[PDB]
Amino acid sequence: SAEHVLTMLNEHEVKFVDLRFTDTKGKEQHVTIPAHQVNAEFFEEGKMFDGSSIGGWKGINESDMVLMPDASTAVIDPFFADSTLIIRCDILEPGTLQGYDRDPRSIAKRAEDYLRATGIADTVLFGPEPEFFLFDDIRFGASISGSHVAIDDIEGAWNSSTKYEGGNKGHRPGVKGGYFPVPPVDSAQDIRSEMCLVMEQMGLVVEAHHHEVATAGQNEVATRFNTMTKKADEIQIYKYVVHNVAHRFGKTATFMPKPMFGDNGSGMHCHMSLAKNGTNLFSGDKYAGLSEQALYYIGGVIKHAKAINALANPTTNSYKRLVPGYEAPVMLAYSARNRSASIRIPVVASPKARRIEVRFPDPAANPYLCFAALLMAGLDGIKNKIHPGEPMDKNLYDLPPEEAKEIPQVAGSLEEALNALDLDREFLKAGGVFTDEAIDAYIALRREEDDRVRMTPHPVEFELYYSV
Amino acid sequence: SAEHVLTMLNEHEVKFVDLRFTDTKGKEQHVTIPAHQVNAEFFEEGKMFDGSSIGGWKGINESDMVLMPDASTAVIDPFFADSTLIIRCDILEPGTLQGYDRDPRSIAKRAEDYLRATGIADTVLFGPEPEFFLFDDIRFGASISGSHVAIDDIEGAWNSSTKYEGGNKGHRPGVKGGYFPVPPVDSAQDIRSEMCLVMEQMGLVVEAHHHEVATAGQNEVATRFNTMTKKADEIQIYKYVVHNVAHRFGKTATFMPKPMFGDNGSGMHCHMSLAKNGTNLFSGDKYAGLSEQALYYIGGVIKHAKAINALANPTTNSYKRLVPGYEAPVMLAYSARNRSASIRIPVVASPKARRIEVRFPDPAANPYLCFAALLMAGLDGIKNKIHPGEPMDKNLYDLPPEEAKEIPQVAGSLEEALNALDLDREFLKAGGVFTDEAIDAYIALRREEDDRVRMTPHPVEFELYYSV
Amino acid sequence: SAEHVLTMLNEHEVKFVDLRFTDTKGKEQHVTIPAHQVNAEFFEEGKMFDGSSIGGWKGINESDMVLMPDASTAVIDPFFADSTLIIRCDILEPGTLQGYDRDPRSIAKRAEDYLRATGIADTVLFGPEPEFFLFDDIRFGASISGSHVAIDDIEGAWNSSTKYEGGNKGHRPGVKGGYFPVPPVDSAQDIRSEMCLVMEQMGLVVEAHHHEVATAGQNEVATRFNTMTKKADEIQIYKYVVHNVAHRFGKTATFMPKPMFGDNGSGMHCHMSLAKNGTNLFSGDKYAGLSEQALYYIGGVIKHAKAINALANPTTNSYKRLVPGYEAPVMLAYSARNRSASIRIPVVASPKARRIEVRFPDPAANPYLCFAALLMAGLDGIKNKIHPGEPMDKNLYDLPPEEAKEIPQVAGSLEEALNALDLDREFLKAGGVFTDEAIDAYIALRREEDDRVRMTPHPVEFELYYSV
Numbered sequence A, B, C: 001s002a003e004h005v006l007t008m009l010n011e012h013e014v015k016f017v018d019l020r021f022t023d024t025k026g027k028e029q030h031v032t033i034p035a036h037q038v039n040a041e042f043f044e045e046g047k048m049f050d051g052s053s054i055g056g057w058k059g060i061n062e063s064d065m066v067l068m069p070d071a072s073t074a075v076i077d078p079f080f081a082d083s084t085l086i087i088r089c090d091i092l093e094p095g096t097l098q099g100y101d102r103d104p105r106s107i108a109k110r111a112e113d114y115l116r117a118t119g120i121a122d123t124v125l126f127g128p129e130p131e132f133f134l135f136d137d138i139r140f141g142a143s144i145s146g147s148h149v150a151i152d153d154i155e156g157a158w159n160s161s162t163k164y165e166g167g168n169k170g171h172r173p174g175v176k177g178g179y180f181p182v183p184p185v186d187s188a189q190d191i192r193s194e195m196c197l198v199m200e201q202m203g204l205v206v207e208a209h210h211h212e213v214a215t216a217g218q219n220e221v222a223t224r225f226n227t228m229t230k231k232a233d234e235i236q237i238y239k240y241v242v243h244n245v246a247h248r249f250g251k252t253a254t255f256m257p258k259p260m261f262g263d264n265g266s267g268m269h270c271h272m273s274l275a276k277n278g279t280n281l282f283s284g285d286k287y288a289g290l291s292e293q294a295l296y297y298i299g300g301v302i303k304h305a306k307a308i309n310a311l312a313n314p315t316t317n318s319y320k321r322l323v324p325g326y327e328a329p330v331m332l333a334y335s336a337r338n339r340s341a342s343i344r345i346p347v348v349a350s351p352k353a354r355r356i357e358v359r360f361p362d363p364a365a366n367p368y369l370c371f372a373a374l375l376m377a378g379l380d381g382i383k384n385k386i387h388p389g390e391p392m393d394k395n396l397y398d399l400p401p402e403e404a405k406e407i408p409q410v411a412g413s414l415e416e417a418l419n420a421l422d423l424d425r426e427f428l429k430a431g432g433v434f435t436d437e438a439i440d441a442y443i444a445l446r447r448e449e450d451d452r453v454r455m456t457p458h459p460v461e462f463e464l465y466y467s468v
Ligand SMILES: Nc1ncnc2c1ncn2[C@@H]1O[C@H](COP(=O)(O)OP(=O)(O)O)[C@@H](O)[C@H]1O
Pocket: A125, A126, A127, A128, A129, A207, A208, A220, A222, A223, A224, A225, A269, A271, A272, A273, A352, A353, A354, A355
């Protein structure tokens, strides 16, 4: 906090302070202030901007907002050359100092408050498992005469034939085979561990690291859960460390859900549970150790899944991952074993660790809005005792049409998720967490992104239709 | 001052002294003298030149002028290899030692004197927000067979498709999107902070630093306000540090108003206020906390805007920024919210900080002449109680022809600004600040620059007319 | 006419008929119809289109218009591979069959009618002297990262140093020196004569051909005068032959007014005279053999010059030619000798050949609208006895400020010419020749072209301002 922060300034001879926050789409933003500009004043009323310059926050008249430093988030940047301290901020409306309707962090905080207000529980626990890719070269573009994307990495199976200037060494993970081969097949041990050390120096707690399924560098660093809002902060720090350590090693990292057709996409499973006075409200006598409270939570998520998709799978690319695969978590059902089920129930020893894992989210999701939406849906399931029906332990739709298998599924496109969010918005507006304008603003930003993809001719359309 | 300067010579074992001053166009100039040439004599009567060699100062007969060191400006150069002390100078006429009519610094000082002489206030406060671009490669030329300009930077969105020799890393700001993404999208954190540290070592006080809106490296370092003339000095030091730190990092910086069509231009908003005995003469009971004195100041600026343009937007390029955009500050009106308004009224807490922000200036402007012109116009607004009319809080001309929206606007071209300055020159000649010859000399220099642009075929004219 | 046309179809075994017309900007357009589609019907009511597809003619609702073949214009295309007959058309409104307000050809015809209606004369004679350039290679472009134009030709003086694959032969016209050197310096004798033979095969009458002043291929083919509308038709045929013969010889021709800075631009002087019952209404007892009727004509042109500019110099490029040169015809005065005068009075033997030469037009001008505007202005000079004042036989403004030499001049920019046309529109609306919508539509098209040039950074601005 304030008192502590002034200490860190001298302990580390800090020269600058990097004010950070997240935009509507979920991208961390920043502005730097010299250390000498930090004072008593600054902490109680923050510093403001010429904001009319950000996206989905742009009001023609009322362009000015306030940056409120959260003294608890203070952490040293491990990359910058001059000693600089990062301080996450909240965006508050001037004078009122209440907390901008469109500020994703404020929204997540409101949802945490509302949890307590309803007395259903006092804390929400989140454990995302975000995956990513490390490449050596990424090129792309689109103009009137065409479009293209070219991915390249030393691990790419396609390079088995490539001439290298010191010789092709040839130990690389094949398609869907990068799982756990030891080095030299796995070329990222040193890279992943650096990411872990740095993540920890930034307040995160690492549980594990490993290469993922896809060829061409899919990797993962598993970090420990935490309270909802703090965890979304951690996700932003996580992405920052990944992006920058990658950069510092001559790589380029991406959190895109599906960079390649034919190999694994990157997902962000979300483990969750509620608690009250140190008791796990999700352990009980019901299915797999679940409380009935947990089942209503599930029911809520299943009822509002398509709307949640607009936040957990916010890109058109997200829908290229959530494609009728067999492992692809698209079926709106729960199970402890079935992998077609978008909600896995971790079979676990201690009741203290009982929870649910919503598998459909991907890393492109704004952690704040996605996490909050998951919660609000779960709470609407509890407030309204929405029974999640029976578990789907049998086997996926590849167990094709048995009754056509008309099991509820996730949105099949962004346009559809956006639609769902438009209509099914009430559960989010509860407790005044999400406002209509906040929701409409979001829908509009994403709608223009969807347009670019729907309007621009796709390379495959030529393969399919040029000789029509 | 003199006494102090002789100290710095020994404290830093200074080997050279760099005499600096600014030409009519606003470019800092210099000549170096060995430290041993500094003495008692030098400070009281300066050292002179073979001046007939400078532009707009060139008189065929009377070519000799005097360089008068201002001992208060002494500062060490942070780039030069041999210890050298910079000393800003004033250009005085020989014998009389009065202060050259065409010397921009002398002109700014005369305007500060005149403020006090009229007793309207004792000090003028200026806070420019100059923006700039950092590129990797800039090429251009014009000959009988053609013309061309090619800009290139690692951040340029157009490079998303470029092959790089170690691989394209791909994290770059899209068009109009370089605003606040954290690194690696923002590639200039280390660069900006170095600029800040150095600026401070040169007497400036930094308030903040951040990437700007445009792709391809638009950046900004916000420095604290100061008295008019001292601030124009600071602008020259600011440009020097930016240009040289950029150079030292393998970049090239430009303060051009509009290097690229389709993305943000660089502006130099000017925050201003007057004061007397430590009281802010701009706080009052009127609109948004303004005094009536502030409104008359505004009235003056609006009345003489087109003439001020000739100094605040002195290039033909300036007019490619001040183009009917929606954010483009071209409407001669004041408002606390409306962004179409070329004069924003900072909505602020403390009356101590009340002021106005004239948004149309750009960095190509000679800080001295531009600042002085702004003042002289404001004073003519006060001396003559020119009511600024009513505020324009409604909404910009994109709120097209409602009455054709015949709101006063800034000059639409340099030729027009020069014209305005020609005719509307009286407010500048007040107090003998600006002389006719000084003004005519300036108009002529700029007029020949305008000619080159008006006379040389433009690439786009071929796109438009070759098949005519 | 109709009867004759059906003859030519069999005499030349015509396979196709090319329907041609001119758009608002002045570019010839076409659509091809098989010869078998020509019949009785076709001539009396034409064939129509899905027109909503043309520029400045685009009405969202009422998109359909009629193509009315003018049987007198029938001529064989000398380039097309299959025998095809060209037939110029008029654009008429459906049902009414009256003649589109925005059809440039209809407008020229209305102006010829109006001449007769006022009884001032029965025929208008026009003799344009359009100049052009023949290049070998022309490249240009503009994107967010830059712009460029590169001209190249075997005659370009800059190629004196170029390595050619069979050796540089070295006989080329220097800057401003391509005037009349005999071949091999003049490399276009064969090219020009082919153009002449073809022009004649297309109904034109050639008076002379020669190389022009500029290096890099400026050339000219002088054709005989003719009645106003027929002459504008001839100009379109002229441009067609030039463009296509050039193409057929491995060259590329342009009618741009000023492709290069530093050498001659291309102009289109317009010789004019009026007649009644075979008598030249311009010969008289007044100045240089002129009638007083001729002087009033001149007066009219001088009064409405800036408005006429919007049609005779319709491009931003046009204003790079009409630049204070000494030979540059920018002064609104008449003279038999002075070359600063934009209106030369040909000193000639026979009274039968007395006329005036308005020198400021360039080839980018829509011949119909430009010619019509010249006439309408001259007629307004006659109807209102506007005395042209006294002749300017002395010497040009290079005979600088003698009284500042406040002689009327042509528009200094397109924006200004467009302005003039906006305000000074009445003389054109006379006789219902030009309608308001027709004029406003034109002004809008050109206004968007002016925008591209005013908004796009110019290469020279970097030369001048990058180090600002
Ligand atoms: N209530 C809870 N109790 C215990 N662990 C939890 C709870 N809520 C969330 N978690 C989180 O489950 C996450 C880890 O999953 P993991 O299976 O190791 O990832 P991956 O198999 O995708 O590499 C951790 O972040 C873990 O701490």
